[PDB]
Amino acid sequence: ARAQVSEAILLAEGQKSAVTEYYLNHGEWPGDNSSAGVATSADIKGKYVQSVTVANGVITAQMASSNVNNEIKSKKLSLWAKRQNGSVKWFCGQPVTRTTATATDVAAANGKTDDKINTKHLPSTCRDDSSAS
């Protein structure tokens, strides 16, 4: 499980440059994959990953539905960044959502627990809470 999740995190990290550069150039986060200049979400695939979706700067990877551990089939994790006075810090954990392109904070984006990869299956360094800062 964790081995599969760690490869999903690495794939999702491949979209960070598009998101960070957009923030650098616009002072706000990209609304979707197209505005970030990246491929459509279902075309960002890999080992164990069916899609990667950019939404207001949050990068959410969705695990594949087959050929993955039963307990993480089709579940999701997010990478997201927050301003910390000039620099930005990237976080990794359960799914989050940023409601607007300019919001500083994020909210948890659970799916009524359905989309959440269980914490036992997240690498120890990818357990950031939605409230992390």
Author numbering: 29 to 161
Paper text:
In the bloodstream an unusually tight interaction between the bacteria and the brain microvasculature endothelial cells is established, leading to cortical plaque formation that results in opening of the blood brain barrier and bacterial invasion of the brain. This interaction is mediated by Type IV pili (T4P), long thin polymers of pilin proteins that interact with two endothelial cell receptors, CD147 and the β2 adrenergic receptor (β2AR). The interaction with CD147 is responsible for bacterial adhesion and the interaction with the β2AR induces signalling in endothelial cells. N. meningitidis PilE (Nm PilE) is 78% identical to Ng PilE and 100% identical in α1. Here we report the 1.44 Å X-ray crystal structure of Nm PilE and a cryoEM reconstruction of the Nm pilus at higher resolution, ∼6 Å, than any T4P structure reported previously.
Nm ΔN-PilE is a globular protein with an N-terminal α-helix corresponding to α1C, the C-terminal half of α1, embedded in a four-stranded antiparallel β-sheet (β1 to β4, residues 77–121). Between α1C and the β-sheet is the αβ-loop (residues 54–76), an extended segment with a single-turn α-helix and a 310 helix that forms one edge of the globular domain. Two residues in the αβ-loop, Ser63 and Ser69, are post-translationally modified in the native PilE3940. On the opposite side of the β-sheet, the polypeptide chain exits β4 and forms a β-hairpin (β5–β6) that lies atop the β-sheet, followed by an irregular segment that protrudes from the globular domain surface then wraps under it, ending in an extended C terminus at the edge opposite the αβ-loop. Conserved disulfide-bonded cysteines at the end of β4 (Cys120) and close to the C terminus (Cys154) define the boundaries of the D-region containing the β-hairpin. The most protruding segment of the D-region, the β-hairpin loop and β6 plus the beginning of the loop that follows β6, is highly variable in sequence among N. meningitidis Type IV pilins and is referred to as the hypervariable region (residues ∼127 to 146). The β-hairpin loop hooks over the top of the β-sheet and across the β1–β2 loop; Ala129 at its apex forms a main chain hydrogen bond with Trp57 at the beginning of the αβ-loop. Not surprisingly, the Nm PilE structure is highly similar to Ng PilE, superimposing with a root mean square deviation of 3.1 Å for all main chain atoms. The only notable main chain deviations are in the position of the β3–β4 loop, which bends away from the β-strand in Nm PilE to a greater degree than it does in Ng PilE, and in the β-hairpin, which is more twisted in Nm PilE and has a two-residue insertion in its loop that allows it to contact the αβ-loop. Since the N-terminal 54 residues are identical in both proteins the missing 29 N-terminal residues in Nm ΔN-PilE monomer are also expected to be α-helical, forming a continuous α-helix with α1C, as seen in the full-length Ng PilE structure.
